Each structure stands twice: as C-alpha cells, then as structure tokens.
Amino acid sequence: TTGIVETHFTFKDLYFKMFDVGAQRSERKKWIHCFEGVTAIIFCVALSDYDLVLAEDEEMNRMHASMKLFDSICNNKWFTETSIILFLNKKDLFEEKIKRSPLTICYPEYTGSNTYEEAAAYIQCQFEDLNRRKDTKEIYTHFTCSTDTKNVQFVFDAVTDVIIKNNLKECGLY
Amino acid sequence: VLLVFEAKIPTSFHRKWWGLNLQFLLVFLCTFMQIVICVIWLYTAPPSSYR
Amino acid sequence: TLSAEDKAAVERSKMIDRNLREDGEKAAKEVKLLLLGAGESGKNTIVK
C-alpha cells in the first residue's frame, strides 16, 4: 500500500532509519513538522534532468522543480538547524548529454564550456547558494554512481560530523 | 573538548558529564584540596619572620 | 489503606512505565534520516 516507507540498515555499529515520503500526494504543510527532529535530510537530485522537461507544464525543466523543492525544504521554519546531504545522481548520463547539449538549456547564464567538471561544479554551486541560512546548517554534496558502497560511507561520515557539531553547539563551543 | 569529540551517538548519559556547573565543580575539587592543605598548614605550624 | 486491586493496578503501571523506559532507551540509539526528492531523481537508485 501507499504511505511512508521505512528502511533500516546497520553500518559501523550505527542503526540508520530512513523515511521515504514520496507517496504522499497532498499538502506538505500539514505533516512535515512530524520530521522536525531528524538528524539529516537526504535530498536526491538527478543531474541528467536539465535537458528533460516536466510534461505537466511543458515549459518546466525538472531541474528547476528540483531547485524549488530543495529551497522550500531547506529554508523551512522547522529545519532551521538540520543538515542536508545532497546526492547529485546520474553523473554518467550528464557526462554524455553535456557533450551533446550545453548546460545553457537549463540555466541561460551559464557562460561555460561543455566539459563535465565545469557544469557539475556549476549545478552544485547553484544548489548550495539557495541555502539562505549559512550559519546553523550545512550541506554535504556527493556525486554518487560508481556502482559501489561509497554512498553509505559518505552518509555515515556526514552523520558523524552532524552529531559532533550538534554536541559542540550544545556545549557552546561552536 | 575530548569528551565532546569522543561521542558518536546522540548522547544521554555523557551529556551530564559536560555541563558548565560540573566543570566549575571539578575546578573546585582541585583547588579545594589545595586550600585544605594550605589551611591545615597555616593552622598547625604557621610561618613567621626571623631576624 | 489500599485495595488488592489497587496494588495490582500500581504494579501494572510500574511495569508499563519500566517497559516505556526501556523502549525510549532503545529508540535513543538510532539515527533518523529523512529522504526526499522525486521519482526520477535517483531516489530508488540511492536506496539501492
């Protein structure tokens, strides 16, 4: 059935629990305060979606919608001290499609070449600059893929950093 | 600082071990041993001035 | 002073509270992460 999906896994003696709420097709301003006390918010953004367009509007890049959703959930009144772990996915499809089409299709003021690195850093910067609260929260960004287990390692390290910094703030030492 | 960095779980018990008043209490214990020794010294055999 | 049913209720309440304490202590030790994105956002792949 639909609803929130709950996932458990143990990694280096830590029991990670994750809650997928993509099945919730309703107003998010009525249940998002339930997740007020979460260690981190893992946000997935597909890099290969700059060329694509959402069929609902036919003039709406899915990357712009991802940016809107990320900004909405980042600067929420409840997540004022919660860290966000960004996952820029499908780096390979981006690698070929940037060779085919420039990133100017999505952002009209890109002003750059068609190499993977410039566009990747550009999308990362455009996402991270949407963090208006640059004092009490941090964004950790990855590029995933690699068909490996480095993703859980990155999540573990980022969660450990979040926990340590939370303790430091609670002590006043940060 | 060491106790804060040693934690890697949302802390419940060791959080009681890095409170400000507890830090001042530990400082008090050390300086209190010192002042106890000094008071016993000045009460039992006090120093004097000699010509 | 108290009825036998009253003592039984008291110890039942104490057992319930003790179980609640154990469950809270257990629930304290895990990390809760909120996963967000879109269907075609690599969300399923990152869960993988």
CB pair distance less than 8 Å for A163 and B7: yes
Q: Which residue has tokens 């002073």? A: C1
Based on the number of CB atoms within 10 Å of its own CB, is A132 exposed (0-12), middle (13-18) or buried (19 or more)?
Answer: exposed
CB–CB of A50/A64 below 8 Å?
Answer: no
Task: Flag whether residue A14 sits within 8 Å of chain B, measured between CB atoms.
Answer: yes
CA distance A146 to A150: 8
Q: Search chain A and give the residue with CA nearest C29.
A: A15
CB–CB of C41/A46 below 8 Å?
Answer: yes
| Mutation for testing the C interface, residue in A18, A25, A41, A44 having most C CBs under 10 Å | A44
CB–CB of A86/A67 below 8 Å?
Answer: no
For the record, the structure tokens of B34 come out as 């010192």
CA distance C35 to A63: 18
| Mutation for testing the A interface, residue in C32, C36, C40, C44 having most A CBs under 10 Å | C36
The CA-based angle A9-A31-A27, given to 5 degrees, is: 120
CB pair distance less than 8 Å for A171 and B5: no
Task: Flag whether residue B9 sits within 8 Å of chain C, measured between CB atoms.
Answer: yes
- Say how many residues make up chain A: 174
CB–CB of A48/A94 below 8 Å?
Answer: yes
CA distance A160 to A99: 37
For the record, the structure tokens of A85 come out as 């772990």
The total of other beta-carbon atoms located within 10 Å of residue C28's CB is 11
**A73, A62, A141, A155: which is closest to A105 by C-alpha?**
A62
Q: In what order do the strands lie in the sheet with C30-36?
A: A5-10, A15-20, C30-36, A40-46, A83-89, A139-142
Give the determination technique. cryo-EM
Half-sphere exposure (Cβ direction) of A92: Cα atoms closer than 13 Å: 5
User: Running DSSP on this structure, what letter comes out for residue C36?
Assistant: E
Find the Cα–Cα–Cα–Cα dihedral A103, A108, A113, A118, rounded to 10°. Answer: -60
Q: Search chain C and give the residue with CA nearest B9.
A: C29
CB pair distance less than 8 Å for B9 and A164: no
The DSSP secondary structure of A125-141, one letter per residue, reads HHHHTT----SS--EEE
